């Protein structure tokens, strides 16, 4: 698996590849790992499924509760402080969870990570999997706060790409998302085997 | 890794830590921040294990703000510090103990200021420097080489800044960035961070 | 082990009227050092003390619950307390926990407030009491002051050769040890008066 | 006073909420069941007052109730009757008869009628099912009797059809599915003011046997089963 | 003195008999539908000149597609809402498709008679609630209304008033009612009755209106979208 | 355990325990609250000084956190109860949720926990209405309301109390734009409105105001006298006007 | 069980119930109890009333433990509770502390337990007030409980059925410096007072507190000690 | 199991508990008690009831308690219901201080009492506690207090009270003859045993139907002292020269 | 002890335009010897849904009759039937109840989509589900799954029409597929069972394999 997030002027973007083994046998090559909690909120799966989809479903009900009880949309800081104190009493079990919560608020754009084990931090760059560390290498000699919108895509794509080129357990196809001051949007969907070409 | 650090004057008491997070390989982070303000002259500093420290520190916290926001003034640090070490003995000794280290830096009307110090068994020592993490083995010393009751403010931070150097010169890891701190009489204040290119 | 994990040492003898309690007053973790000024030595009462070592958190821990139930007794019927009920007191205290126990072990010394008869009291990990008229020793350097006090130890002391015979003891005990030292407290009790002293040892 | 509560024996050995809530049985829309040789029928009214609520539930594919007292206390001995009917299918792989369920029914309900802050389910049932030994038609009331009978029904003025019945009861065991369609609904016709006439929007029907399963029929199905009137 | 599961001498209990005299007491609410969405009205019962309007909230939202008006005791009514949604919400996890109407109201219409001293009542249960709800919302099969009492017999209905004056305003609702009369003159008509039945005037803020049409959501009408239809 | 049935229905609807709790209500001590256009006031009153009292003590204006004060005009036993649960409530949500609370989140609460003990087994009303006010972000003062029954309502000037009847009827001709224009001439319409029910002048007083940030304030007498004396002055220049 | 107090104040302030316990002591088989310097005195009376009745299987003077003596005034029925429950905490005390419970404490946990059952869930008062004896670091002590939860450190007192004509007599023949051999004397010769028909050694029962344990006199002392 | 209770908590009619005001009237027959706070300590005065061949001078006192090094109480109703409210408050303190190893504040110990006694008047359906108190203290944020308590949770802090039989025309006389702030340990003892044979009905004090306690700090220590037979023979002797000199 | 068995019974599903279908094999074994050769692994839920399992049979029997029980609650408790959506989001839940103490089953659900299309739903132990088109799941998983890609998905291939599926054709194909499987596993053989969903109902087949 392999997950990046990032934040700068005109938001927030999120990308993730489409592959899942079982040992060395690839089960499937078309998994959804970009998470739509709803239409201002956006998730991320990495490590086990079934968790990263059960927890994330009860924070989008939970959500959706504060709304119609408060009558005001909730904050991306309070969500990943649920999310936190959620999984915290399963310690010690043998949960895997890693996750990106993204949005934006009345003070801005917001980029929180989460795991099982408790850390939840704040940040502008982030990447998560097997092959994060392929990635971060791409990711920062290249970022910038003062970009468009037209470089960040290019950017995130090719992070993935050359992280699926030297990782074993991740491959498939690439998916973007982007957020804004509205919602978020499917930008495209694109696969390895067509970006090889447009490169060398 | 962790680093905290505590020295304590004749009228005034100054802190310091890193500030830097990382998942074994990477560190993800290089803005934290490990201290926790539990009142107006009142300072946590917490370390250790991932989902313990926020924990325990924000639970001290709500309860030391409501004993204000109920009675009509401010806790004392003495009593601070033993309210923090009888409820970590006591969650101890369950199915949820926490894993952490901490010191309580602070300052009062009466007593002057105080610095204390927890070794995650619920010690709860006291002394006039303190320090934590692997580091406090190349900066203990230095201090015991040049501290005096009577320092002055200017120079207790050049000796931080020595020890910081130290530091940097025979430790394995980064550690590139420290915050900094100071209590007086007034208040709390926060100083240019200790920062090495 | 756990109880070496910080170190600890502490002693008492009896004389004719006067009883005497000796402890060390340092704090650290299983090789480094803290702190020189750590309490070990707790008065529960007038004329009655107590020294506990082994681990600090219960150390604490105890002293407190402690302070509690001989508060309560006090307040209770007007009475300072006798040295037998107290030791009678922590054994229970120590009892109720033979699962998930504390780690420390205790020492009594006093008087009676009736003829000021001195008394000595030594317990262990679980409450088994050890009165005894030469001396009691609790800690980690407990086979280097059993050898030591077998071999000065008379059975009539006046304070003076009482406070100069727990002390030689005590350091030339603690000087082969080296997770137990960096300072010594003494404390000589009287009909009339007591005396708090601190000696000249090396920290090394 | 030996009135206002249910652990209160009156000297002459009635308890009289029980009655009370007998009482809340005659005063709901009527309904009607009766046993063929290979069938069971049962009907209603649904008196609108204009919309108003059904009165013919399911509870498995060989057997279903009709109801003529408290709603809301009904759905709870309904569910009672779902749970058990799973649990004999999940554990013995069998449909559960009505025998038995009938007798636990009753057991469930003695319980309020002995002891304190309690109160007796107000409704009556009436119950239609089919198994081995052919069809089956149990009525229950409020305290925990229950009976098993020919031809029965139950509401305000219940007495005309039941008289009905009782001349015409040397009839059934041979007639044919609409012949006791037409029998039912003709002595359902009597609990009237002598000023209405049955319709498509008040009669609801149910229908059990050997080679259907419960089937029911709304507003819109029950015209094919009016023909054939009189005066 | 009496208990309250003590039924009378007419098979009726008598906490809800009683409960049911008091929403004779309430503002009136009045609930339409139609072949193209739903349409809900309320009172306010204003008392003085200084007390700000806009928080009293007498119809709310229970999901996208479905509403709420209540009358009687607006203080019972919070906690049986909240329970509503959540029972929503719980559907949608498990099953990822919307309530029924009629599911909804029959989920609520289960904790009406929980109530009783002999139990240890963990939830404290003592009593009936007094109110009258009206519910209403898009499905899978059109739009639907519904009524429920303080006994749970929850009965679905084409139009219908409650309140105090729901004697005489239910004939006029009577009347005016066709299976292909559409929505404009569904709202027209309840806000004559209004008229005719409220006391001191009728503004648009003493007023709260609500549709469930198809194809949008759950809607609440401004000030400025409601004055724009009272110039009759 | 005690399960037994305290509050109940009755031949017309008339839940009596509220009724009942509603007329201590009618016979404790007089309280004013005011919205102005940048400061709120609150005016509690009819305090019986017997001038052997330590006046912090018995006070009646409290604080529940930074953001938010209150008054009330009923038993004392449960109003600290009430303050208490509060102030409990207001710091969990500051710690669950990284803000501080509303004046709507924390009146919605007490209004739930009134309604719990008119409908729980082995329970009692409370016998208290508040008087919260507090300042919302982005400013925007807010003045609310409660029964011991479980309402609640915005008002813009509302007194509780006794005596609360003559308030309100001398508000509701009183208050006006152009008489609210600074924060010396909200404070007078309390004096003012107080007047009434005081017995013998300026003795019995309690003011208060928030501002913007200042978290709370309370006047000594020194003010008091010099606002009762302008008042005695535009009393003395209207009559000689008429 | 019923969860709800009984005994409730009445208009005027008063608990009602306690009076009417209060009552029934009133004929509760009058007792007498004298303190001297040596020791401490406690003497009932019985009331067999028939010769086909025993003697030697009916005892009112109960020890607590090898120092601590009992009596009482009132329902037999109601002081067999009260003297489990203190030969109960007397062993907790020992227990916890390895000493023998001073007799002050007793009266205080006995007199918790008496006011504990004032004001709990369906039950009512009992209806006895105690005399307890003790010695303690060289000095008697004399103690009376309430069915109120009240307990006064008395010196030569008396309750039952002529107590108001039994104090009296009492107050005017104390002299405060007696030995343990005539306030046994006085102790008999008050009842003498109020007791009708021959009186004789089967119709008394004594025990003593001196500086050896809490003891019971056999007939053949009573015997001895009622011949003047 | 419905026709043997009285609800034991319920609004009257008009708004108000009965069993509440009830033991407040009960309390007004009960031992005469008065306290005082002057600028150098704080007295407490308290009038006894008994009078025989008692075995007097037993204990510490019959009326004053303890509660800590710092604080003692002069409870003036039931004694049963009492003997146990003194152990609540010894117990809050003992936590208090092992939590916070500090001293307990005077007004937290009164709250948390105050508190204990309310859900007896909503909760259960047990009667309520029928005792009125006075706390003396000293604590070091606002030094000497002396604080009241009522049977339902309401408290309230004063210079100068009295409670007990005949607690209104003490108060009254008193509200005149005390000088604020102008006040020492020396004079208010004057006035207290003035005010108490001006209150009390017997014709003059014998000095043993009488009580008196004072607390006072002395070298960092605070003591807590009950006045000898000797004392208070003194102190009476010393107000009837006083009066004599009118 | 152990709790857990391995059984076999590999599993095959496939989607259309208008029809669904699900093979399996028809044999039961435990080590190195056979219990029998008549058991399926496919049953029918409703008129428009059927569902396979393999792996542990005993965890197998109790989840079909809990689902068995819960759709006639869900029938009771709206007044309507169940889709296939529905099903799979239950499924889902009823799994991860278990996260500590887990089935063993691998279930796949074919059907017809809410309009008129084929639904295939592909499950895992834990409760992760995702549509697909067609899947192998099972202990021969590794022996189908490269084959139905490229006679499917056309992967790998170059100038080669799409050419939509039909009935037939997927029939036949399955047909061969389970045919040359068994001949190199050891669990899977001695019948072939094939249950076909379409417009009209649910119809069945039977097919023989070789005995071993």
Same mark, same amino acid.
């Given at each position: ?11 927030v ?9 079982a ?20 998730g991320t799966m ?9 927890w994330?479903?009860?924070?989008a ?8 009880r ?16 959620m999984?915290?009493?399963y310690?010690?079990?043998?949960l ?6 993204c ?17 939840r ?29 037209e470089?960040?895509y ?12 030297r ?8 998916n ?6 509205d ?18 | ?9 004749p ?6 830590s ?14 934290h921040?490990?201290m926790?303000k ?34 009509g003034?401010?806790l ?7 309210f923090?070490?009888?409820n970590?003995?006591?969650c101890?000794?369950?199915?949820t ?34 320090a934590?993490?692997?580091?406090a ?13 009577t ?37 709390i ?6 920062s090495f290119p | ?12 003898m009896?004389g004719?009227? !006067? ?14 050092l ?12 007038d004329?009655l003390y ?20 001989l ?22 205290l120590?009892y ?14 006093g008087?009676?407030?009736?003829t000021?008869?001195?008394?000595? !009291? ?5 409450? !088994? ?9 609790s800690?980690? !350097? ?6 030591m ?18 002390s030689?003891?005590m ?7 080296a997770?137990?030292?960096?300072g ?21 | ?15 009289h ?10 005063q ?10 290979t069938?069971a ?5 649904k ?11 399911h ?8 109801i ?42 003695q319980?309020p ?8 389910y ?23 009797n229950?009976?098993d009978?020919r ?24 007639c ?18 002598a ?8 009669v ?8 259907l ?19 | ?17 009683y ?6 007491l ?14 809900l ?13 806009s ?8 999901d ?13 009514a ?13 559907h949608w996890?498990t099953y990822?498709?919307?309530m ?12 009406a ?5 002999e ?5 404290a ?16 099969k ?21 309140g105090?004056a ?38 648009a ?14 809607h ?6 409601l ?6 | ?37 940048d ?25 529940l ?9 009923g038993?004392?036993a449960?109003?600290?109860?009430v303050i208490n ?12 949720? #990284? ?7 924390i ?10 003990y008119?409908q729980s ?5 409370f ?5 919260i ?8 003062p807010?003045?609310?309301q ?10 813009? =000037?509302?007194?509780?109390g ?6 309100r ?11 609210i ?11 003012k ?14 003011? =208060? ?13 020194? #003010? ?5 004396? #302008?008042?005695?002055? #535009? ?8 | ?14 608990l ?14 009058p ?16 009331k ?5 009745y @025993?003697?030697?299987s009916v ?9 601590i ?9 109601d ?22 419970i ?31 004896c003790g ?10 409980? @309430?069915p ?10 008396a ?18 410096d007696?030995?343990?051999? @005539?306030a ?15 009186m004789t050694? @089967?119709?008394?029962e ?7 344990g ?6 053949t002392?009573?015997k001895?000690?009622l011949?003047? | ?8 908590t ?14 407040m ?12 706070l ?6 407490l005065?308290?009038e ?15 009326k004053?308690?303890?509660l ?11 004694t049963?219901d ?12 003992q936590?208090?201080?092992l ?22 008047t ?7 506690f029928?005792?009125?108190?006075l ?15 009522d ?6 802090g ?15 006389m ?40 004072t ?18 023979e ?7 020269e ?5 | 002890?152990?709790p ?48 396979g399992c393999?792996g542990?049979h ?12 819960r759709?006639?609650?869900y ?12 099903i ?24 017809l989509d ?14 992760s ?22 006679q ?31 001949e ?16 009209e ?12």
């Amino acid at each position: 698996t392999t997950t990046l997030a990032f934040k700068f002027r005109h938001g927030v973007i999120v990308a993730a590849d489409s592959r899942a083994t079982a040992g060395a046998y690839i089960a499937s090559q078309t998994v959804k790992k970009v998470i739509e909690i709803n239409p201002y909120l956006l998730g991320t799966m990495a490590g086990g499924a079934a968790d990263c989809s059960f927890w994330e479903r009860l924070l989008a009900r939970q959500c959706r509760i504060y709304e119609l009880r408060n009558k005001e949309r909730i904050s991306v800081a309070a969500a990943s402080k649920l999310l936190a104190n959620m999984v915290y009493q399963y310690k010690g079990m043998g949960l895997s969870m890693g996750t990106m919560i993204c949005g934006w608020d009345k003070r801005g754009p917001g980029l929180y990570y989460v795991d099982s084990e408790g850390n939840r931090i704040s940040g502008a760059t982030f990447s998560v999997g097997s092959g994060s560390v392929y990635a971060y290498g791409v990711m920062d000699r290249g970022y910038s706060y003062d970009l468009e919108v037209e470089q960040a895509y290019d950017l995130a794509r090719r992070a993935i790409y050359q992280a699926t080129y030297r990782d074993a357990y991740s491959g498939g196809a690439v998916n973007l998302y982007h957020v804004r001051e509205d919602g978020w949007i499917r930008v495209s969907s694109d696969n390895v085997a067509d970006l090889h070409e447009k490169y060398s | 890794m962790e680093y905290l650090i505590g020295i304590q004057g004749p009228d005034y008491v100054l802190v310091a830590s890193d500030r830097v997070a990382a998942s074994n390989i990477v560190q993800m982070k290089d803005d934290h921040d490990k201290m926790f303000k539990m009142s107006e002259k009142i300072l946590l500093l917490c370390v250790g294990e991932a989902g313990d420290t926020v924990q325990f520190a924000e639970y001290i916290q709500k309860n030391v703000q409501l004993y204000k926001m109920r009675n009509g003034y401010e806790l004392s640090p003495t009593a601070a510090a033993n309210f923090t070490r009888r409820n970590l003995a006591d969650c101890l000794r369950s199915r949820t103990p926490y894993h952490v280290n901490l010191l309580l830096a602070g300052y009062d009307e009466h007593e002057g200021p105080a610095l204390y110090y927890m070794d995650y068994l619920a010690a709860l020592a006291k002394a006039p420097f303190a320090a934590h993490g692997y580091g406090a083995f190349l900066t203990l010393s230095i201090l015991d080489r040049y501290y005096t009751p009577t320092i002055s403010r200017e120079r207790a931070v050049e000796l931080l800044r020595k020890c910081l150097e130290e530091l940097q010169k025979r430790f394995i890891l980064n550690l590139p960035t420290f915050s900094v701190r100071i209590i007086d009489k007034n208040g709390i204040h926060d100083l240019d961070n200790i920062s090495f290119p | 082990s756990i109880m070496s994990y910080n170190g600890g040492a502490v002693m008492a003898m009896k004389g004719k009227n !006067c009883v005497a309690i000796a402890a060390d007053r340092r704090f650290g973790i299983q090789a480094q050092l803290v702190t020189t000024d750590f309490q070990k030595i707790f008065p529960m009462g007038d004329r009655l003390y107590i020294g506990l070592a082994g681990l600090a958190t219960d150390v604490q821990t105890v002293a407190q619950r402690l302070k509690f139930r001989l508060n309560l007794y006090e307040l209770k019927e007007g009475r300072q307390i006798k040295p037998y009920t107290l030791m009678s007191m922590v054994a229970n205290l120590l009892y109720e926990k033979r699962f998930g126990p504390y780690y420390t072990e205790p020492v009594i010394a006093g008087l009676d407030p009736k003829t000021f008869k001195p008394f000595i !009291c030594s317990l262990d990990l679980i409450g !088994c009491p050890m009165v005894t008229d030469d001396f009691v020793v609790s800690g980690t !350097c407990a086979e280097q002051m059993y050898g030591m006090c077998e071999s000065l130890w008379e059975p009539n002391m006046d304070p003076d050769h009482l406070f100069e015979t727990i002390s030689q003891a005590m350091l030339n005990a603690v000087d082969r040890d080296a997770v137990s030292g960096m300072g010594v407290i003494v404390h000589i009790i009287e009909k009339d008066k007591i005396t708090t002293r601190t000696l000249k040892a090396r920290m090394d | 006073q030996y009135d206002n509560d249910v652990t209160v024996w009156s000297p002459q050995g009635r308890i009289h909420q029980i009655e009370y809530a007998m009482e809340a049985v005659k005063q709901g829309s009527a309904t009607v069941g009766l046993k063929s040789k290979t069938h069971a029928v049962l009907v209603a009214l649904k008196r609108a007052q204009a919309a108003h609520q059904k009165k013919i539930l399911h509870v498995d594919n060989h057997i279903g109730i009709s109801i003529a007292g408290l709603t809301a206390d009904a759905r709870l001995l309904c569910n009672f009757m779902r749970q058990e009917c799973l649990d004999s299918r999940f554990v013995f792989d069998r449909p559960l008869p009505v025998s038995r369920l009938v007798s636990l029914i009753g057991s469930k309900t003695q319980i309020p009628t002995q002891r304190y802050g309690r109160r007796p389910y107000g409704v009556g049932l009436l119950i239609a099912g089919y198994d081995d030994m052919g069809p089956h038609i149990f009525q229950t009331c409020p305290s925990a009797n229950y009976f098993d009978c020919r031809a029965m029904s139950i509401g305000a003025r219940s007495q005309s059809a039941r008289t009905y019945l009782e001349r015409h009861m040397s009839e059934f065991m041979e007639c044919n599915l609409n012949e006791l369609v037409k029998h039912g609904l003709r002595a359902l016709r009597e609990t009237l003011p002598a000023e209405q006439d049955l319709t498509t929007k008040n009669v609801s029907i149910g229908i059990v046997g050997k080679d259907l399963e419960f089937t029911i029929y709304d507003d819109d199905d029950v015209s094919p089963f009016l023909e054939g009137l009189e005066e | 003195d009496r208990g309250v599961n003590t039924f009378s001498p007419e098979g009726r209990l008598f906490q809800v008999e009683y409960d049911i005299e008091a929403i004779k007491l309430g503002s009136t609410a009045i609930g339409i539908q139609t072949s193209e969405g739903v349409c809900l009205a309320v009172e306010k019962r204003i008392t003085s000149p200084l007390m700000e309007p806009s928080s009293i909230e007498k119809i709310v939202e229970i999901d996208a597609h479905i509403g709420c008006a209540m009358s009687g005791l607006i203080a019972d009514a919070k906690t049986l809402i909240d329970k509503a949604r959540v029972e929503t919400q719980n559907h949608w996890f498990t099953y990822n498709e919307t309530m029924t109407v009629e599911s909804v109201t029959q989920a609520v219409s289960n904790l009406a008679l929980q109530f009783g001293e002999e139990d240890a009542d963990p939830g404290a249960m003592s009593r009936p609630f007094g109110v009258a709800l009206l519910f209403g919302g898009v499905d899978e099969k059109g739009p639907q209304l519904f009524h429920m009492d303080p006994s749970g017999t929850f009965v679905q209905c084409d139009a219908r008033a409650i309140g105090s004056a729901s004697e005489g305003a239910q004939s006029s609702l009577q009347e005016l009612y066709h299976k292909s009369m559409t929505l404009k003159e569904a709202i027209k008509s309840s806000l004559i009755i209004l008229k005719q039945v409220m006391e001191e005037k009728l503004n648009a803020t003493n007023i709260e209106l609500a549709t469930v049409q198809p194809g949008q959501n759950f809607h609440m009408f401004t000030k400025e979208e409601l004055e724009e239809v009272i110039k009759d | 355990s005690y399960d037994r049935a305290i509050t109940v229905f009755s031949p017309d609807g008339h839940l009596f325990q509220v009724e009942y709790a509603q007329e201590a209500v009618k016979k404790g001590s007089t309280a004013v609250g005011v919205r102005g256009r940048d400061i709120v006031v609150l005016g509690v009153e009819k305090k019986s000084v017997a001038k052997l009292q330590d006046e912090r003590t018995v006070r009646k204006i409290c604080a529940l956190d930074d953001n938010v004060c209150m008054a009330f005009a009923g038993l004392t036993a449960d109003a600290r109860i009430v303050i208490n649960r509060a102030r409990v409530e207001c710091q969990s949500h500051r710690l669950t949720v #990284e803000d501080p609370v509303t004046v709507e989140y924390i009146t919605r609460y007490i209004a739930s926990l009134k309604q719990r003990y008119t409908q729980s087994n082995g329970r009692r009303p409370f016998g208290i209405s508040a008087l919260i006010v507090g300042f919302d972000f982005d400013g925007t003062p807010r003045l609310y309301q409660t029964d011991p029954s479980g309402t609640y309502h915005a008002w813009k =000037a509302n007194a509780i109390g006794r005596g609360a009847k003559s308030v309100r009827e001398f508000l509701e001709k009183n208050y006006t734009d152009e008489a609210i224009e600074t924060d010396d001439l909200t404070i007078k319409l309390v004096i003012k409105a107080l007047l009434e029910v005081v017995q013998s002048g300026g003795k019995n007083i309690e003011l =208060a105001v928030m501002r913007r940030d200042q978290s709370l304030k309370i006047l000594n007498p020194e #003010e008091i006298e010099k606002y009762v004396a #302008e008042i005695e002055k #535009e009393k003395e220049e209207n009559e000689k006007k008429k | 069980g019923y969860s709800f107090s009984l005994t409730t104040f009445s208009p005027s302030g008063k608990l009602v119930q306690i009076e009417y316990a209060l009552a029934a002591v009133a004929g509760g088989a009058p007792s007498v109890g004298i303190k001297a310097a040596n020791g401490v005195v406690l003497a009932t009376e019985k009331k067999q009333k028939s010769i086909l009745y @025993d003697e030697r299987s009916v005892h009112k003077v109960e020890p607590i433990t090898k120092h601590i003596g009992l009596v009482y005034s009132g329902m037999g029925p109601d002081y067999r509770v009260l003297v489990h429950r203190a030969r109960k905490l007397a062993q907790q005390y020992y227990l916890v502390y390895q000493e023998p419970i001073p007799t002050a404490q007793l009266v205080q946990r006995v007199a918790s337990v008496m006011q504990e059952y004032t004001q709990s869930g369906g039950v009512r008062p009992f209806g006895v007030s105690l005399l307890i004896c003790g010695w303690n670091e060289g000095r008697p002590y004399l103690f009376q409980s @309430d069915p109120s939860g009240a307990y006064f450190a008395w010196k030569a007192t008396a309750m039952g059925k002529n107590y108001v004509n039994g104090k009296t007599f009492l107050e005017k023949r104390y002299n405060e410096d007696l030995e343990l051999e @005539d306030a046994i004397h006085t102790a008999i010769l008050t009842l003498k007072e109020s007791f009708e028909g021959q009186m004789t050694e @089967d119709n008394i029962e004594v025990g003593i507190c001196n500086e050896a344990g809490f003891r019971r006199l056999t007939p053949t002392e009573v015997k001895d000690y009622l011949a003047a | 199991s419905r026709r043997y209770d009285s609800r034991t908590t319920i609004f009257s009619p008009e708004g108000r508990l009965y069993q509440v005001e009830y033991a407040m009237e009960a309390i007004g027959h009960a031992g005469t008690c008065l306290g005082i706070l002057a600028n150098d300590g704080v007295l407490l005065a308290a009038e006894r009831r008994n009078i025989h061949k008692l075995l007097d001078e037993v204990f510490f006192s019959e009326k004053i308690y303890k509660l800590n090094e710092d604080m003692a109480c002069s409870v003036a109703g039931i004694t049963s219901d009492a003997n146990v409210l003194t152990n609540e408050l010894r117990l809050i303190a003992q936590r208090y201080l092992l939590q916070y190893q500090e001293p307990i504040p005077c007004e937290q110990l009164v709250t948390a009492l105050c508190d204990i006694k309310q859900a007896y008047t909503q909760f259960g359906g047990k009667r309520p506690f029928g005792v009125s108190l006075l706390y003396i203290g000293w604590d070091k944020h606002y030094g000497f207090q002396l604080y009241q308590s009522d049977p339902s949770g309401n408290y309230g802090g004063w210079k100068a009270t009295c409670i007990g039989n005949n607690s209104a025309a003490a108060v009254s006389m008193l509200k005149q003859d005390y000088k604020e702030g102008e006040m020492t340990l020396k004079s208010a003892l004057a006035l207290a045993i003035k005010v108490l044979n001006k209150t009390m009905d017997v014709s003059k004090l014998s000095a043993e139907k009488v009580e008196i306690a004072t607390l006072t700090r002395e070298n960092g220590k605070t003591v807590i002292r009950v006045l000898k037979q000797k004392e208070v023979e003194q102190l009476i002797k010393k107000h009837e020269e006083e009066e004599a000199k009118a | 002890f152990s709790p857990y068995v391995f059984n076999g019974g590999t599993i095959l599903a496939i989607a259309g335009e208008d029809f669904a279908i699900v093979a399996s094999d028809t044999r039961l074994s435990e080590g190195f010897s056979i219990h029998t050769r008549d058991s399926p692994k496919c049953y029918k839920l409703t008129d428009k849904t059927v569902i396979g399992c393999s792996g542990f049979h005993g965890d197998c029997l109790t989840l079909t009759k809990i689902i068995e029980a819960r759709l006639k609650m869900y029938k009771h408790s709206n007044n309507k039937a169940m889709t296939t959506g529905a099903i799979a989001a239950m499924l889902s839940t009823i799994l991860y109840s278990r996260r500590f103490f887990p089935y063993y089953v691998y279930n796949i659900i074919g059907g017809l989509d809410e309009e008129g299309k084929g639904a295939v739903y592909s499950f895992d132990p834990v409760g992760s589900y995702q549509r697909d088109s067609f899947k192998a799941g099972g202990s021969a998983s590794a022996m189908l799954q490269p084959l139905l890609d490229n006679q499917v998905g056309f992967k790998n291939m170059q100038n080669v029409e799409h050419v939509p599926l039909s009935l037939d054709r997927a029939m036949r194909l399955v047909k061969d597929v389970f045919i040359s499987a068994a001949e190199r596993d050891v669990y899977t053989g001695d019948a072939l069972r094939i249950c076909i969903v379409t417009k009209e109902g649910i119809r069945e087949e039977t097919v023989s394999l070789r005995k071993d």
